[PDB]
Structure formats: C-alpha cells, structure tokens
Design a protein around this ligand. Structure first.
Ligand SMILES: [Fe+3]
Ligand SMILES: [Fe+3]
Lengths: 132, 132
C-alpha cells in the first residue's frame, strides 16, 4: 500500500501558497482556442530562491465518460537565481505561472499538479463545459 | 564535426511556420514580473495532429557579459488528439503557444527553441533591456 496519492496534497489556495490555482472559462466552444492560466502562489506568494522554489506545473484533462486522464502539458520553471558567483546572485528567475492554450471537443475536468523542490506535490481541479 | 547547431534552423516567421515567435517587452524594470509569450505558427499555422505536431517550446536567457545561457523553462505540449478510438479522435489538443513569467536583473537575450516531431529544431531570439 504505497501510493503517490498519499503524497499529493490539496488545500484551499486562500490558506495554502502551494496549491496551483486554475483560471479557465467555465464553458467554451468546441475547437476554439481556450486559455488556461495556472499559478502557484496566487494569493500567498511562494519563495523563488536557489534553495526553495516551484519546479513545475502540469495540466491534465479528464474527458467526462473517459476512463483516462491526458497530459495536456508539463511547464518547467528552471531558473532560480543560481550562478557561478553563488546561489541567488543570478540574473533570472522563472515564476510559477503559465498560460497554456488547448482545443477541446468534450466537457471534462482540468486537473493541475505542481511540484515544489522541498514541499512535494499539490493539486487542484476545475470542471469545463464544451458546446457547439 | 557533428554539431546540434547544424540542425537548429532559423527563418523569418513570416515565411516559416516552424519559427517560434517571441513577444516580450523591449525594456523592463529590475525584478518586475515580465510576461514572455512564445508561439509556433504565429503567422502561418502549423498542424496539430497525432502524426505531426509541435512537441515543445524552450526559453533560454543569455545575460549580457555572461559566458553561459540559462534555461528559463521547457513548456511541453502533450495532447494531440490521440485516443484508444484511433488517432485524431481524442478530446484535447495542446496548441504550441505559452506565456511564461520571469524576473530579470540584467539585460540580455531571450532565445526561443522549439521542436517539431518531424521537422526538427527551430530558434529565434530577441534582446531585452533591464533598468532600475
Ligand atoms: Fe515550497
Ligand atoms: Fe512540423
């Protein structure tokens, strides 16, 4: 009985900085380009230092009535002030927010998963309706 | 004499659908959140099918006067209509456009690299100035 799920946390993003917050329309037209914004640290900011940072956000789509989830994408945030001069002396920091664009032809659920280098995995989800 | 560079192409995105197009401000303030939008198929659309699609966009930052490039991030577009029902029968397509957010403290060059599953690697770049 060792499951990854035991170590995927969810919380109210109002209480917890680590929760990825999905911003996506509630209902869209079939095949139109939909913008999905996912942010970690939306209400409570999360640190972005060489030692402590959000590594990535991943988005999944679960089509209603489908048995599976589909990986929409993985969005890696890879600069956190590292330098040959020392940690946090670098020129560039990648913030844990991403806008991805999808085309859907069926209603389903958007699932966001994020990973902190020291605080593990965090998730949220939001239903999305598709129409002609 | 086998170099990856021999197989990284650049072109005018007006002529070539495969070129990643950077949209970023020309000049920013030190440590403010800067939005960088990168799109493949900005002017000429590129296919998004199970058989033929853009896999990812990667962003690099080259700080002026630094010897190195830094990987800002890798943004994977992972759904292209695959299904147990057959190719291109799936519910979701991830379009090759991404918005990433960075904080810079030095002027440099944004370098975009993209990868098509059948047409290889493509790049573009744009200078960015930082100020107090
Ligand atoms: Fe953390
Ligand atoms: Fe191609």
């Amino acid at each position: 009985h060792m499951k990854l799920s035991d170590f995927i946390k969810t919380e109210d993003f109002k209480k917890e900085k680590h929760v990825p917050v999905i911003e996506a329309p509630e209902k869209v037209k079939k095949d139109e380009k939909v913008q999905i914004v996912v942010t970690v640290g939306k209400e409570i900011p999360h640190p972005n230092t060489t030692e402590h940072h959000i590594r990535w956000i991943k988005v999944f789509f679960q089509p209603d009535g489908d048995p599976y989830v589909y990986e929409v994408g993985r969005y890696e945030f890879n600069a956190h002030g590292e330098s040959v001069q020392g940690p946090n002396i670098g020129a560039v920091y990648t913030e844990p927010t991403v806008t991805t664009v999808v085309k859907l032809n069926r209603s389903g659920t958007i699932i966001a998963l994020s990973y902190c280098n020291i605080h593990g995995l965090w998730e949220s989800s939001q239903k999305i309706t598709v129409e002609e």
